[PDB]
């Protein structure tokens, strides 16, 4: 039948209306699955992998990755959502919902004989108008702690339990404010997300310092040093071999002893430099040295350091070099050729924590750390994973809010206002693209619909109530998730990231326009 099948007999081809129907069905299925995720009233999903790992989540992107899907259009939507998560860290579920609703509304007119090109033109015009309105509606405002708290709550409440969200809001906002420099881009690598598995979920907190997942490797090391100098180094204190195949030659046992003793002089020189620095810095027992080394330390050097009362750690992470130099305030050293007291970090408390077979080291009471750690506690692995995803979303939301002082009212109020603006702008559009503009507005209207449906209220009645209130009053009224009545999102404290909304509009419109114009799907690589 098809030309491709004429060339490649075992080729799968969907042509003309078939390809569009296939794409729309896939988008509708994805939207049907992801509808229940939207809003704090959404339902958790349990995802079990092949090996039996359990993951509880509500994140749209996480759900898309763990969904057992084998469809091309679903793959494209998943890639779009992955990009949205990577850049902004929020709006993945909204992304999928808007794409699916756009495709459904477009099909509603295409099935009436309309060419998809006109619908795409209407989509482009509506996207331009909606972007203009979004620029007109955002609330530019210098952000103190209150607005950041509100944004973090608006994200974490949708991601986790209410009390856990309350704790995580303070954690994330305090961490961001701690690591934020004035008029400088925020580096999220400087916040360490370490997870321990012993306490309850509400015991997770923020440490104004650093937490390491390894401890001292010598049993005679001090377990808690009160006042500490931090020596952040990247020098291999363990034994090393010559690059040029050295070998040893001797003629007697005494010569063997001499060679054995003389083979560790190179490392002992570095160890002696460290010991001399420690003795010069502190001659009393009041203070102490913590030596965090990115490279290993052989047991001989560990013993030599421990005899001098120096606690040392080996095989630290690469990012921990910057984390310690910013928190404690020292200088990371790749050699000990010229080491001075001014290259030493400071820490008002360093102690070691044991949990089962795992070992942890806390570096606390820093003067004014520029890199903090977010300690995650929970009784389950899946609880830790959920909290980690929620904290990632909250950190991204707070950073996005800080990036541009504008913030957008949430609860679907901006979607309703944009829908009304597009409807009013529709007469200005020339031609049959008015149908595409109307479809775009109806697709934008999905967010309040899904929010009301998840909250358990009637969809259409709640939507018409919201629209009537907004039309008669002109305010940015959203969907209340406890009563269903119209509510002013700005006054209540439901905030949305402006960058998230702009990225949603751009990506959804682009991908929907590209999909609508596809008229053939081919798989002709076999044979």
């Amino acid at each position: 039948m098809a030309a491709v099948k004429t060339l490649n007999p075992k080729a799968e081809v969907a042509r003309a209306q078939a390809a569009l129907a296939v794409n729309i069905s896939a988008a509708r299925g994805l939207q049907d699955v992801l509808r229940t995720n939207l809003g704090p009233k959404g339902t958790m999903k349990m995802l079990v992998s092949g090996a039996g790992d359990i993951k509880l989540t509500k994140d749209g992107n996480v759900l898309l990755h763990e969904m057992q899907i084998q469809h091309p259009t679903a793959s494209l939507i998943a890639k779009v959502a992955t990009a949205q998560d990577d850049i902004t860290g929020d709006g993945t579920t909204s992304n999928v919902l808007i794409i699916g609703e756009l495709l459904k509304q477009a099909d509603l007119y295409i099935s009436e004989g309309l060419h998809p090109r006109i619908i795409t033109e209407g989509f482009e015009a509506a996207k331009e108008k909606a972007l203009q309105f979004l620029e007109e509606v955002k609330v530019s405002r210098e952000m103190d702690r209150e607005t950041l708290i509100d944004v973090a709550r608006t994200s974490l409440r949708t991601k986790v339990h209410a009390e856990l969200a309350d704790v995580l809001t303070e954690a994330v906002v305090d961490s961001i404010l701690a690591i934020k420099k004035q008029d400088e881009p925020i580096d999220l690598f400087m916040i360490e997300i370490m997870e321990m598995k012993h306490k309850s979920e509400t015991d997770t907190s923020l440490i104004r310092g650093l937490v390491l997942d390894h401890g001292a490797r010598h049993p005679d090391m001090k377990k808690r040093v009160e006042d500490a100098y931090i020596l952040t180094c990247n020098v291999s204190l363990e034994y090393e071999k010559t690059e040029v195949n050295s070998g040893f030659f001797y003629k007697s046992a005494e010569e063997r002893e001499k060679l054995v003793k003389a083979e560790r002089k190179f490392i002992e020189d570095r160890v002696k430099k460290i010991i001399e620095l420690k003795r010069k810095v502190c001659g009393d027992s009041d203070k102490g040295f913590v030596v965090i080394n990115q490279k290993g330390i052989d047991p001989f050097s560990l013993d030599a350091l421990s005899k001098e009362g120096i606690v040392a750690l080996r095989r630290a992470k690469r990012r921990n070099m910057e984390r310690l130099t910013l928190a404690c305030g020292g200088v990371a050293l790749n050699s000990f050729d010229d080491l001075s007291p001014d290259c030493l970090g400071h820490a008002g408390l360093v102690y070691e924590y044991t949990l089962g077979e795992e070992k942890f080291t806390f570096i606390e009471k820093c003067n004014n750390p520029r890199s903090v750690t977010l300690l995650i506690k929970g009784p389950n692995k899946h609880t830790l994973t959920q909290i980690k995803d929620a904290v990632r979303d909250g950190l991204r939301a707070v950073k996005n809010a800080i990036d541009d002082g504008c913030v957008v009212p949430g609860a679907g109020a901006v979607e309703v206002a944009m829908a009304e603006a597009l409807i009013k702008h529709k007469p200005s559009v020339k031609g049959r693209a008015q149908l595409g503009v109307q479809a775009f507005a109806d697709a934008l209207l999905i967010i309040p619909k899904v929010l009301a449906q998840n909250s358990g209220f009637d969809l259409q009645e709640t939507l018409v109530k919201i629209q009537a209130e907004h039309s008669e009053s002109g305010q940015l009224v959203g969907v209340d998730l406890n009563t269903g009545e119209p509510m002013v999102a700005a006054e209540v404290g439901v905030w949305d990231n402006y960058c998230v909304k702009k990225q949603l509009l751009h990506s959804c419109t682009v991908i929907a326009t590209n999909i609508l114009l596809v008229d053939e799907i081919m798989r002709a690589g076999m044979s």
């Binding site: 040029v244 008229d519 002709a524």
Partner: protein
């Protein structure tokens, strides 16, 4: 025992069946992408056997992703690849033209005309088409940026990037202009090596831009180095900055107590000597295609120098062209001229969750990178393909400033000219000449069909218009299905693209018309 002259798996097909099969295969290959031509073309989804998805309406990608068995289809796909590589545009046009010429040749082959007569007529028609195409061309002032932007626009109105036309046109024009180079009396463009396209999913498409420099996905080796340098002095290297084994076997034999420590100290001193040799030029940035040792990092850091390691050779060449540096593989031979001054800013910033290194304020850079921001990977891939088409068209115009009316005007004018020329042959070969002359109408017909208007009425009106005297520029408005004068619509294409398309299609027909016997199944015997 089945004794045979040839092997069992050898199968031989011969006769008019072979010609019919070849022509039908070419027709079907044309029909694959017949609908992907014109400003109203519809995109296609290709499922890569490696698992990826390719969404495009470019002819070459679609035909490349298809696996076929009939070797005539393989010939057509190779034709598409050749047209793409030579000029970068007109892939669908050349495929459709080859199919149409083979159809009108099969017409005569069904009668008692030998294929060689058709070949001779086709070659004569090719000469006449080249002559007419050169005749109806117009010159272009390359200095006028408006005309160049209009040409690139006409080249990109048929792609998905057409919605952002001014942005894409400016990006392509700036990239092509600043990659243009001239040395030793030789002029070159080299879009392939320099003028890199780096795509980062996310953001918005309007944020895409061409940088006055090179951007790489690399970070500083040590966090203590500067991530923002105002006017860097860049030094590029190939050799590693670490102690390495010699070429020959160089085993040592230690019999004294202090030889081990001396060996290790000598290693350290050699690293320090290399770093001092680098420092002697007082640079700010050191880029190495290979590793940089931790001790080397320390010694560079003590001199307040930012170091980046493990960079691809192509990226290092691009950086050298952008900042005007020379790669040196031996630091002891580093010269002042080798130090790269000309970069106006170096800055490492975080995009998303991954660090990127920018050298993006070069004065007079001969290499550039194009930063693409988009919805996802497939959208950005299609955008990059469209940008490649735009850059290829721009370089073709820069090499040859001749333009030809587009949107079917050139094909109709050439068809009319050849039809008029055929009136004075009075030979048996005039019929194939006329047939291949009017076979060029498939391009306006395809434009009308994709637009949606009536093919027969519009095509007849266009032919009647072209029968007049000064109407060579009358084509089809592919968006509204009406006849317009393309000196008013403004659609123009480089003469090189049209010439290459016509030549390739005619010679594809010639090559596939010389075949009347197919044997297959024999081993490679390699």
């Amino acid at each position: 025992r089945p004794v045979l002259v040839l092997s069992q798996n050898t199968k031989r097909e011969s006769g008019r069946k072979v010609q019919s099969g070849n022509i039908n295969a070419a027709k079907t290959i044309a029909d694959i992408i017949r609908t992907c031509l014109g400003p109203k073309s519809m995109m296609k989804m290709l499922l890569d056997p490696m698992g990826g998805i390719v969404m495009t309406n470019d002819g070459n990608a679609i035909l490349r992703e298809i696996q076929v068995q009939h070797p005539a289809a393989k010939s057509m796909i190779e034709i598409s690849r050749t047209q793409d590589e030579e000029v970068g545009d007109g892939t669908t046009s050349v495929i459709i033209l080859a199919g149409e010429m083979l159809s009108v040749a099969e017409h005569f082959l069904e009668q008692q005309m030998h294929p060689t007569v058709v070949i001779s007529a086709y070659r004569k028609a090719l000469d006449d088409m080249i002559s007419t195409l050169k005749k109806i061309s117009i010159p272009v002032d390359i200095s006028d940026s408006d005309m160049m932007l209009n040409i690139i626009n006409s080249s990109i109105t048929t792609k998905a990037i057409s919605r952002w036309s001014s942005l894409a046109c400016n990006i392509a024009l700036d990239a092509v202009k600043m990659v243009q180079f001239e040395e030793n009396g030789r002029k070159e463009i080299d879009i392939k090596k320099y003028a890199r396209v780096e795509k980062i999913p996310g953001g918005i498409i309007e944020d895409s831009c061409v940088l006055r420099g090179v951007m790489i996905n690399k970070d500083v080796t040590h966090p203590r180095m500067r991530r923002y340098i105002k006017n860097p002095r860049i030094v590029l290297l190939d050799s590693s900055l670490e102690y390495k084994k010699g070429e020959s076997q160089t085993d040592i034999e230690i019999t004294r107590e202090e030889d081990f420590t001396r060996i290790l100290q000598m290693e350290e001193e050699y690293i320090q000597q290399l770093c001092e040799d680098i420092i002697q030029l007082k640079p700010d940035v050191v880029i190495t295609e290979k590793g940089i040792s931790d001790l080397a990092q320390h010694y560079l850091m003590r001199a307040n120098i930012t170091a980046i390691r493990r960079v691809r050779k192509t990226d290092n060449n691009r950086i050298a062209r952008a900042c005007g540096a020379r790669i040196v593989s031996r630091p002891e031979e580093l010269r002042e001229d080798d130090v790269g001054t000309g970069a106006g800013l170096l800055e490492i910033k975080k995009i998303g969750d991954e660090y990127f290194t920018f050298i993006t304020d070069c004065k007079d850079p001969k290499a550039c990178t194009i930063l693409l921001r988009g919805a996802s990977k497939e959208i950005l891939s299609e955008v990059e393909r469209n940008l490649q088409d735009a850059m290829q068209v721009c370089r073709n115009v820069l090499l040859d400033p001749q333009l030809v009316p587009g949107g079917g005007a050139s094909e109709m004018a050439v068809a009319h000219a050849l039809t008029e020329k055929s009136k004075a042959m009075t030979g048996v070969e005039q019929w194939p000449y006329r047939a291949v002359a009017q076979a060029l109408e498939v391009i306006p017909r395809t434009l009308i069909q994709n637009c949606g208007a009536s093919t027969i009425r519009l095509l007849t009106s266009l032919r009647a218009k072209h029968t007049q005297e000064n109407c060579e520029t009358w084509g089809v408005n592919g968006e509204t299905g009406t006849l317009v004068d393309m000196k008013e619509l403004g659609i123009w294409e480089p003469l090189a693209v049209k010439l290459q398309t016509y030549k390739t299609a005619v010679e594809t027909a010639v090559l596939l018309l010389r075949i009347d016997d197919i044997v297959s199944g024999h081993k490679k015997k390699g």
